Coordinates of C-alpha atoms and ligand atoms in Angstrom, one line a residue:
Chain A
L1 CA 0.1 -0.4 0.1
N2 CA 1.9 3.7 -1.0
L3 CA 0.8 6.0 2.0
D4 CA 2.4 8.2 0.9
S5 CA 1.7 8.4 -1.9
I6 CA -2.6 8.5 -1.8
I7 CA -1.8 10.9 0.7
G8 CA 0.1 13.1 -1.3
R9 CA -2.3 13.4 -4.6
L10 CA -5.1 14.3 -1.7
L11 CA -3.1 16.8 -0.4
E12 CA -2.7 17.5 -4.2
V13 CA -6.0 19.8 -4.8
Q14 CA -5.6 21.9 -2.1
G15 CA -6.3 25.3 -2.6
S16 CA -7.0 24.0 -6.4
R17 CA -10.6 25.0 -6.3
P18 CA -13.3 23.9 -4.0
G19 CA -14.9 20.8 -5.5
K20 CA -11.6 18.9 -7.7
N21 CA -11.9 15.1 -7.0
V22 CA -9.6 12.8 -6.1
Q23 CA -10.0 9.3 -7.6
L24 CA -8.1 7.1 -6.1
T25 CA -7.7 3.5 -7.5
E26 CA -10.1 1.0 -5.4
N27 CA -7.4 -1.3 -4.7
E28 CA -5.6 2.0 -2.8
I29 CA -9.0 2.9 -0.5
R30 CA -9.3 -1.0 0.0
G31 CA -5.2 -1.1 1.0
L32 CA -6.7 1.9 3.1
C33 CA -9.9 0.1 4.0
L34 CA -8.4 -3.4 5.3
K35 CA -5.4 -1.2 7.1
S36 CA -7.1 1.4 9.1
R37 CA -10.0 -1.9 10.2
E38 CA -6.8 -3.3 11.3
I39 CA -5.5 -1.0 13.5
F40 CA -9.3 0.0 15.2
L41 CA -9.4 -4.3 15.5
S42 CA -6.0 -3.8 17.5
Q43 CA -6.8 -0.4 19.2
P44 CA -8.8 -0.3 22.7
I45 CA -12.0 0.1 21.6
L46 CA -12.1 3.3 24.8
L47 CA -9.5 5.0 23.3
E48 CA -7.2 5.7 26.6
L49 CA -5.1 9.4 25.0
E50 CA -2.8 12.4 26.1
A51 CA -3.1 16.3 25.6
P52 CA -2.4 18.5 24.1
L53 CA -4.6 17.1 21.6
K54 CA -7.6 19.1 18.9
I55 CA -10.8 17.2 18.4
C56 CA -12.9 17.4 15.6
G57 CA -16.7 17.7 15.4
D58 CA -19.0 16.1 11.7
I59 CA -17.1 16.4 8.5
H60 CA -20.1 15.1 6.4
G61 CA -17.1 14.8 3.3
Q62 CA -16.9 18.1 3.2
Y63 CA -14.0 17.8 2.0
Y64 CA -12.3 21.4 1.5
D65 CA -13.2 22.3 4.3
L66 CA -11.3 19.4 6.2
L67 CA -8.4 20.8 4.0
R68 CA -9.4 23.9 5.8
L69 CA -8.9 23.0 9.6
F70 CA -6.0 20.9 9.0
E71 CA -4.2 24.2 7.9
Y72 CA -5.2 25.8 10.7
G73 CA -4.4 23.4 13.0
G74 CA -1.5 22.0 11.4
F75 CA -1.6 18.8 8.7
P76 CA -0.2 15.6 11.0
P77 CA 1.6 14.4 12.4
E78 CA 2.0 18.4 13.3
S79 CA -0.6 18.1 15.6
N80 CA -2.5 15.0 17.6
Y81 CA -5.9 14.5 16.6
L82 CA -9.4 12.9 17.1
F83 CA -12.5 12.9 15.2
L84 CA -15.7 11.8 17.1
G85 CA -17.4 10.5 13.7
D86 CA -20.2 11.2 10.8
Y87 CA -17.5 11.8 7.9
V88 CA -19.2 10.8 5.3
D89 CA -22.8 11.3 3.3
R90 CA -24.6 15.6 2.9
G91 CA -21.3 16.6 1.6
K92 CA -20.3 16.8 -2.3
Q93 CA -16.4 14.5 -0.7
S94 CA -17.0 11.9 1.4
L95 CA -14.6 9.6 -1.3
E96 CA -11.5 11.9 -0.2
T97 CA -12.8 13.4 3.2
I98 CA -13.1 9.3 5.3
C99 CA -9.9 8.2 2.8
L100 CA -8.0 10.9 4.0
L101 CA -8.1 9.9 8.2
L102 CA -8.5 6.8 7.1
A103 CA -5.0 6.6 5.1
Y104 CA -3.1 9.0 8.4
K105 CA -4.8 6.4 10.5
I106 CA -2.5 4.2 8.9
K107 CA 0.1 6.6 8.8
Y108 CA 0.6 7.8 12.6
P109 CA -1.4 5.4 14.5
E110 CA -0.3 7.0 17.6
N111 CA -1.0 10.0 16.8
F112 CA -4.1 10.2 14.9
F113 CA -8.0 9.1 16.0
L114 CA -11.6 7.7 14.2
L115 CA -14.7 8.1 16.3
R116 CA -17.6 6.2 15.2
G117 CA -20.2 8.5 14.1
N118 CA -23.9 7.3 13.6
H119 CA -23.7 8.1 10.0
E120 CA -20.1 5.2 10.0
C121 CA -23.4 2.6 9.2
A122 CA -24.3 0.6 6.8
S123 CA -28.3 1.6 6.8
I124 CA -27.8 6.3 7.5
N125 CA -25.6 6.1 4.5
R126 CA -27.6 4.2 1.7
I127 CA -30.0 6.9 3.0
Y128 CA -27.3 10.4 3.1
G129 CA -25.4 9.7 0.4
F130 CA -22.3 7.9 0.3
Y131 CA -24.0 4.6 -0.8
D132 CA -24.9 7.2 -3.1
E133 CA -21.6 8.5 -4.2
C134 CA -19.5 4.7 -4.4
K135 CA -21.8 3.4 -6.2
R136 CA -22.0 6.5 -8.8
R137 CA -17.7 6.6 -8.3
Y138 CA -16.4 3.5 -7.8
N139 CA -19.4 0.5 -7.1
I140 CA -20.9 -1.5 -4.3
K141 CA -18.6 -4.2 -2.8
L142 CA -16.0 -0.7 -2.1
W143 CA -19.4 0.2 -0.4
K144 CA -19.5 -3.1 1.7
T145 CA -15.9 -2.6 1.8
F146 CA -16.0 1.1 4.2
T147 CA -18.7 -0.8 6.3
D148 CA -16.8 -3.3 7.5
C149 CA -13.9 -0.5 8.4
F150 CA -16.7 1.6 9.4
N151 CA -18.7 -1.4 11.8
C152 CA -15.0 -1.2 13.7
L153 CA -14.1 2.0 14.7
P154 CA -13.2 2.6 18.2
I155 CA -16.9 3.7 20.4
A156 CA -15.4 6.9 22.7
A157 CA -12.1 8.2 24.3
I158 CA -11.1 9.8 27.4
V159 CA -8.6 12.0 27.2
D160 CA -6.1 12.8 30.3
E161 CA -8.9 10.3 32.7
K162 CA -11.7 13.5 32.9
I163 CA -12.7 14.2 29.4
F164 CA -14.8 11.5 28.2
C165 CA -15.9 12.1 23.9
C166 CA -18.6 10.1 21.6
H167 CA -20.5 11.0 18.7
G168 CA -23.5 11.0 20.3
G169 CA -24.1 11.1 24.0
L170 CA -24.9 9.6 27.2
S171 CA -27.3 6.5 27.9
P172 CA -29.2 5.8 30.7
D173 CA -27.4 2.0 29.8
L174 CA -23.8 3.3 31.1
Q175 CA -23.3 2.8 33.9
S176 CA -19.3 2.3 33.7
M177 CA -16.7 2.4 31.3
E178 CA -16.3 -1.3 31.1
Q179 CA -19.4 -1.7 29.7
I180 CA -18.7 0.3 26.8
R181 CA -14.8 -2.3 26.5
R182 CA -16.8 -5.7 26.4
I183 CA -18.8 -4.1 23.1
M184 CA -17.4 -5.9 20.7
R185 CA -16.3 -5.3 17.0
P186 CA -16.8 -6.0 14.2
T187 CA -20.6 -4.4 15.1
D188 CA -23.0 -2.9 13.1
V189 CA -25.6 0.2 15.0
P190 CA -28.4 -1.2 16.8
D191 CA -31.7 0.1 17.3
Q192 CA -31.5 0.1 21.1
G193 CA -28.7 -0.4 23.8
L194 CA -25.5 1.4 25.1
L195 CA -23.8 1.7 21.6
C196 CA -26.4 3.4 19.9
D197 CA -26.9 6.1 22.4
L198 CA -23.6 6.7 22.2
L199 CA -23.9 7.6 18.7
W200 CA -27.4 8.7 18.8
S201 CA -27.8 10.8 22.1
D202 CA -28.3 14.2 22.9
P203 CA -28.3 16.9 25.5
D204 CA -31.0 18.5 26.6
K205 CA -32.3 22.4 28.4
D206 CA -35.8 21.7 28.4
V207 CA -35.6 18.0 29.5
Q208 CA -34.9 16.4 32.6
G209 CA -33.3 13.3 33.0
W210 CA -34.5 11.6 30.6
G211 CA -36.7 11.8 27.5
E212 CA -37.7 10.8 24.0
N213 CA -35.5 11.9 21.1
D214 CA -36.7 13.6 18.1
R215 CA -34.9 11.9 16.1
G216 CA -37.0 8.9 16.6
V217 CA -34.4 7.0 18.2
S218 CA -32.1 6.6 21.1
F219 CA -33.3 10.0 24.3
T220 CA -31.7 13.4 25.2
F221 CA -30.5 13.7 28.0
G222 CA -30.4 17.0 30.6
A223 CA -28.0 18.7 32.7
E224 CA -28.5 16.8 35.7
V225 CA -27.9 13.7 34.0
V226 CA -24.2 15.2 32.8
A227 CA -23.4 16.7 36.1
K228 CA -23.9 12.7 37.9
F229 CA -22.8 11.8 35.3
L230 CA -18.3 13.3 35.5
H231 CA -19.2 13.5 40.0
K232 CA -19.8 9.7 39.4
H233 CA -17.1 8.9 37.3
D234 CA -14.8 11.3 38.6
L235 CA -14.5 13.6 34.6
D236 CA -14.5 17.3 33.8
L237 CA -16.1 17.4 30.6
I238 CA -18.2 15.5 27.6
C239 CA -16.5 17.2 24.2
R240 CA -19.6 15.5 21.7
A241 CA -20.8 16.2 18.5
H242 CA -23.5 15.1 16.6
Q243 CA -25.4 19.0 16.1
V244 CA -25.3 21.5 14.3
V245 CA -25.0 24.9 16.4
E246 CA -23.9 28.0 14.9
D247 CA -20.9 29.1 16.6
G248 CA -19.1 25.7 15.6
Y249 CA -19.2 24.7 18.9
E250 CA -21.6 25.0 22.6
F251 CA -21.1 24.9 26.4
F252 CA -23.6 23.5 27.4
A253 CA -24.5 22.3 31.9
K254 CA -22.1 25.1 33.4
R255 CA -19.5 23.9 31.2
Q256 CA -19.8 20.2 31.7
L257 CA -20.0 19.1 27.9
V258 CA -19.4 20.6 25.0
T259 CA -20.7 20.2 21.3
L260 CA -18.3 19.8 18.7
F261 CA -19.0 20.6 14.7
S262 CA -16.7 21.5 11.6
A263 CA -18.7 21.8 8.7
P264 CA -19.4 25.2 8.4
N265 CA -22.2 26.5 5.5
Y266 CA -23.8 22.6 6.8
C267 CA -27.4 24.4 8.0
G268 CA -30.5 25.6 6.5
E269 CA -32.3 27.5 9.2
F270 CA -28.8 29.3 9.3
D271 CA -25.4 30.6 8.2
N272 CA -23.3 27.8 11.0
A273 CA -19.5 27.5 11.8
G274 CA -17.5 24.3 11.8
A275 CA -15.6 24.6 15.5
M276 CA -12.4 22.4 16.0
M277 CA -11.0 23.0 19.7
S278 CA -7.5 22.8 20.9
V279 CA -7.2 20.7 24.1
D280 CA -4.4 21.4 26.1
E281 CA -1.3 19.5 28.6
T282 CA -3.8 20.9 31.6
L283 CA -6.9 20.5 30.0
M284 CA -7.5 24.1 29.7
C285 CA -9.9 24.1 26.1
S286 CA -9.1 26.9 23.0
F287 CA -10.9 27.3 19.3
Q288 CA -9.9 27.2 16.0
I289 CA -13.5 28.3 13.9
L290 CA -14.1 27.8 9.9
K291 CA -16.7 31.3 10.2
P292 CA -19.6 31.4 7.3
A293 CA -19.3 31.7 4.3
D294 CA -19.3 36.4 5.1
Chain B
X1 CA -34.6 21.5 8.6
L2 CA -31.8 18.7 6.4
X3 CA -34.2 15.5 7.7
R4 CA -34.3 15.0 12.1
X5 CA -31.8 12.1 11.4
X6 CA -30.2 16.0 11.5
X7 CA -30.4 21.9 10.5
Ligands
MN301 MN1 -24.1 12.6 14.2
MN302 MN1 -23.6 14.5 11.7

């Protein structure tokens, strides 16, 4: 697998013109999937990470924005990264997006990390774009290759035993971190349960405890739930993504939880910014933002 | 507003 050649070609379009494709060969993409899948299975499903590092929320195929993020935070290995999921669907270039991320995971396996988002799931892909992108630019078999790789993505990460990170949010079934560690891979995302909640739940200012989620799956949770969770697990923060927030980032429950969304100009109801959070050695937070197209 | 599966 000529990783460096793949990376050079992916990065080659930087500055060329927003929207220009990078068409890797199916064998190259297959290689990225198989090698990264191997690494994913080899590392914990619940990642134990160290700061400083940069954390990114949803990308959703906005390849040129991913490039802007790396330009801002420093292209690997200039900085450690943790992506919270949702690499595909919606955007115009999910293929280039997921391919660069998998390439960097293989390249810097101890300094680059990717968590599973609710969109790294076959059924959702069929509806939101990735399936069609793969069918058009490659073939359906390659899409299956991607899903097998997705089925092995880690589910959560804890930065220096204080910051709990996952794509969606908390789960009413999450009593112990060992429950997460017990989750076996490969696996698809179920319709209910811990794994489902970690990839689907949302915090809710108006909810007392656990509530029903308008997404038609999982739950919503209140600030008290968060406060209780951090206390019980001796954590300081919950870092998640999943929801589109106008400023690219948004704090919840007296800054006990933060939502990160890294795809700018994604929302139809509003022009959102895309944010990337820098967590320093003392676990202090700062942001690098892609402000909406003025 | 994109469609709640989610703007
Ligand atoms: Mn999501
Ligand atoms: Mn998303």
